[PDB]
């Protein structure tokens, strides 16, 4: 390649955090094949994107405007403040007025201008009703004013893109590990599993042998499955037991070819189920890791139901996603497959009833799929679609009909589910997949989706040896089409994160309570960085529309919180920014912020769900991005303190919690009596939202040091990485004006809200369960494909009328009353002292 073409790939590499041209850790060309394969989807989408829409990235939705926002518009009038220089003129508008019209009613009171939000790279442009812009909806909910500046549209030139019937068998040669302890005397054997969507088709193990650094077997393992019966995507799973090591090899390759020949596979060690176990990547660390040597030496392609069985069938289909299928259930599902195909909700269980280890059945299964009239006309059910993209499905045709459904998601909804879509790539047998191409397409079509796609990917690439390789191929494909302007923005962001992280680690390795000394070191380090050299503005990775300028080193500090987190403040790079407020970012090692990311995203989904039912529980899912191993960034919400601090103020380092302090804190913090009363109601709304959300997720029992509140009454939980269903302590209860078995107007309001909030979530039980399940598989350590997952099943009272459920939750609230400060107090003894 050219001297400059090389220098382009180094740039990508630095952006990616991984080198997709390195081939030290492959035994085939699937990654490189995927690179070339992804060229066609990339160019297609880049070739088909409107340059101007793309450059301006309008953030819109096609959902109805919630009942709670209509009410704020009691005139069918919407005021917009337009800004030009120092001048400023407000303009009445109809909620249905497109920006081209609003412009046109304005030059009435040279037409190549565009309405941009003040202090943001956010544009109100395009043929969408003014009421259908997310920013406009955001202002309304909060009671904030829509301020827009009239300026020139961004030049799309900046967005330039750089130009057989034999039974299967496998010979296990031996295992090799360089150094083991002396020793103790252990015994070992090799387990070989033919897997498909975590379904084991057959299993053979070798005999036991004393665990030495080299163990040779030279043995053929003969399986019962015929070569012609192997399904594409089946894994050869190789495991060592004393279980200590595992590695996987795809039996059918990306070219539909039977794997053949000599392999030396460096395995992964178990630390002390999860999607890492599924990876087709081998350990990069060839010098320390256990290695296994094997050899391969073996190419592909009615009657109406009796009333009682259908009833039996329907009772099966109506059950939840975590419900086990019996042998009888699968035989029923399958025998009556044609009837089953008419029910979209049956699809996951139906496709779990497939004998994937039998070629004729799979063939019949494909026959089923060609008559997908009922599936293709059905309304998108994201919960349902997601269930087909999890670890239970390895068949690419099955996974493809799910992705097909995702095609109709609009940007607004693709964002909601993006994080978990990206995580779902881990369940893909192959690097190139429909899901992967989908993500690729949607990122290249929309800068906001693309920005978040980038950071999500880069997050896994930086802490996942198991899947970094695959993702990097995908991230590269995206960066080769997002265009020059973004490349630069990304570069800026990456430099910033890499420099601040360096500062973060360096600061932590100085102590374990507070130090005038360490604060002084921090500011000094920041002085060196600010000049020189750190990009002179950079987009905020969790709030892309926002541009951070220069540090306000005076306001920066080291928080006395544990892992010694950096509290950072920035000026806004955009001078057209109304307020004079800084941009606050916490930078912290070492929490596994991936968990925090996932909890917060599900939180945003709960918000969206509630939105469909015209509810606003006032959640505050602040931005959070895991950038690397136990390191990442967190959005600082302005004017917010922890409930714990509120209580350490009036009393010292106790303990002796008081009921009235919180209300007291709100009145002090309220300028008028009108603002106070708004804060009191907002507290009631934000409290209820978190009580419900944390309970359904099983993270309700928290110490109040992990619960915050805004000066405006917005309660919110943080740090997601006897007992209580959630935190509803006397202080919260006092604010609503009640204490100890004494209802009240604000408290009836509270209850009533929770129930509505609760029963609404239950209408989306399956979605919540699949997202939870996946979250656990791709986001938390090894788990139990049983008990962890089942908490939420119990929490959402699966299989009960709305009446029992309402009463279930009210009961949960009563548990809180009865416990009072008992549980907080306990938390205090434990976390504060021992
Ligand atoms: C005592 C100090 C240093 O003078 C400050 C410390 C900051 N506190 C508030 C505070 C404390 C701990 C916090 N901890 C987190 C946090 C979140 N997730 C994880 N994993 N770890 C820590 N987030 C916070 N918020 C969140 C957004 O609002 C502002 C910061 C946060 N705020 C006020 C006085």
């Amino acid at each position: 390649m050219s001297e400059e073409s090389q220098a382009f790939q180094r740039q990508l590499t630095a952006l990616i955090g991984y080198d997709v041209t390195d081939v030290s850790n492959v035994h085939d060309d699937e990654l490189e094949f995927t690179r070339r394969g992804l060229v066609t989807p990339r160019m297609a989408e880049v070739a088909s994107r409107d340059p101007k829409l793309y450059a301006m990235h309008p953030w819109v939705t096609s959902k109805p405007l919630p009942e709670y926002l209509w009410k704020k518009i009691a005139n069918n009038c919407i005021f917009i403040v337009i800004h030009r220089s120092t001048t400023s003129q407000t303009i009445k508008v109809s909620p249905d007025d497109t920006p081209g019209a609003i412009l046109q009613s304005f030059f009435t009171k040279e037409q190549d201008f565009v309405l941009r939000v003040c202090g943001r790279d956010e544009y109100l442009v395009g043929e969408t009703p003014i009421k259908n812009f997310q920013w406009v909806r955001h202002c309304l909910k909060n009671g904030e004013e829509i301020h827009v500046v009239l300026d020139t549209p961004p030049d799309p030139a900046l967005d330039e893109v750089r130009k057989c019937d034999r039974k299967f068998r496998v010979k296990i040669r031996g295992i090799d590990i360089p150094v083991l302890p002396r020793n103790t005397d252990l015994t070992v054997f090799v387990e070989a599993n033919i897997q498909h969507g975590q379904q084991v088709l057959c299993q053979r193990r070798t005999s036991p042998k004393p665990f030495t650094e080299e163990v040779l077997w030279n043995v053929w393992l003969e399986f019962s499955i015929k070569i012609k019966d192997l399904p594409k995507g089946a894994l050869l799973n190789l495991q060592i037991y004393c279980l200590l090591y595992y590695v996987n090899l795809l039996l059918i390759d990306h070219r539909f070819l039977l794997r053949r020949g000599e392999y030396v596979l460096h395995m992964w060690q178990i630390s002390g189920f999860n999607a890492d176990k599924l990876t087709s990547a081998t350990n990069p660390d060839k010098e320390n890791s256990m290695s296994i040597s094997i050899l391969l030496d073996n190419h592909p392609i009615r009657a109406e139901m009796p009333n009682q069985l259908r009833k039996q069938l329907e009772a099966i289909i109506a059950t939840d996603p975590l419900n086990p299928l019996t042998a009888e259930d699968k035989e029923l599902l399958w025998h009556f497959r044609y009837e089953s195909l008419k029910h979209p909700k049956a699809y996951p269980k139906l496709f779990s009833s497939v004998k994937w280890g039998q070629q004729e059945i799979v063939a019949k299964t494909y026959q089923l799929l060609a008559r997908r009239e009922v599936w293709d006309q059905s309304a998108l059910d994201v919960g349902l679609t997601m269930q087909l993209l999890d670890c239970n499905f390895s068949d690419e045709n099955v996974r493809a009909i799910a992705v097909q459904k995702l095609e109709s998601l609009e940007d607004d909804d693709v964002l909601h589910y993006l994080l978990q879509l990206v995580q779902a790539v881990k369940f893909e047998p192959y690097h190139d997949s429909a899901l992967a191409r989908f993500l690729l397409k949607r990122g290249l079509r929309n800068k906001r989706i693309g920005h978040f796609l980038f950071w999500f990917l880069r997050s896994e690439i930086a802490q996942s040896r198991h899947y970094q390789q695959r993702f990097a191929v995908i991230l590269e494909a995206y960066l080769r089409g997002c265009g020059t302007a973004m490349l630069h923005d990304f570069t800026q962001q990456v430099q910033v994160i890499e420099m601040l992280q360096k500062v973060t680690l360096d600061i932590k390795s100085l102590s374990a309570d507070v130090s005038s000394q360490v604060i002084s070191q921090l500011k000094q380090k920041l002085e060196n960085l600010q000049n020189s050299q750190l990009p002179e503005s950079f987009r905020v990775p969790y709030d892309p529309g926002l541009k951070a300028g220069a540090l306000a080193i005076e306001k920066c500090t080291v928080m006395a919180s544990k892992k010694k987190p950096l509290w950072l403040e920035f000026k806004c790079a955009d001078p057209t920014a109304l307020s004079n407020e800084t941009i606050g970012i916490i930078f912290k090692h070492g929490d596994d912020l991936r968990q925090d990311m996932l909890i917060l995203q599900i939180l945003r989904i709960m918000e969206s769900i509630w939105e469909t039912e015209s509810l606003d529980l006032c959640l505050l899912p602040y931005g959070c991005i895991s950038t690397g191993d136990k390191i990442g960034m967190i959005e600082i919400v302005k004017d917010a303190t922890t409930i714990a601090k509120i209580q350490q103020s009036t009393v010292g380092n106790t303990g002796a919690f008081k009921d009235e302090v919180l209300n007291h804190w709100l009145k002090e913090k309220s300028p008028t009596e009108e603002k106070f009363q708004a804060a009191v109601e907002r507290f009631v709304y934000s409290c209820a939202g978190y009580c419900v959300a944390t309970f359904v997720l099983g993270i309700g029992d928290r110490h109040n040091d992990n619960i915050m509140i805004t000066e405006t009454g917005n309660l919110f939980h943080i740090d997601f990485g006897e007992r209580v269903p959630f935190v509803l302590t006397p202080d919260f209860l006092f604010v609503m004006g009640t204490s100890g078995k004494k209802t009240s107007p604000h408290f009836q309001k509270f209850q009533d809200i929770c129930v509505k909030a609760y029963l609404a979530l239950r209408h989306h039980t399956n979605l919540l369960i699949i997202l939870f399940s996946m979250m656990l598989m791709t986001g938390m350590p090894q788990l139990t494909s049983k008990e962890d997952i089942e908490y939420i099943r119990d929490a959402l009272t699966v299989g009960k009328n709305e009446e029992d459920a309402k009463k279930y939750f009210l009961d949960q609230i009563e548990v809180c009353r009865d416990k009072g400060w008992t549980v907080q107090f306990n938390w205090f003894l434990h976390l504060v002292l021992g």
Side-chain angles (χ1 to χ4, degrees), residues 557-561 565 567 584 586 588 591-593 596 600 620 622 624 634-642 645 648 705-706 708 716-721:
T557 185
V558 172
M559 317 171 36
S561 133
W567 170 290
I586 291 185
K588 187 187 186 189
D591 284 281
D592 179 16
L593 296 175
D596 300 64
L600 289 152
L620 199 54
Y622 48 91
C624 177
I634 304 168
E635 170 187 358
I636 290 168
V637 175
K638 293 293 181 81
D639 292 309
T641 187
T642 89
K645 190 185 180 57
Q648 65 220 357
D705 196 26
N706 308 107
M708 303 190 80
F716 64 106
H717 290 221
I718 65 181
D719 209 326
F720 298 114

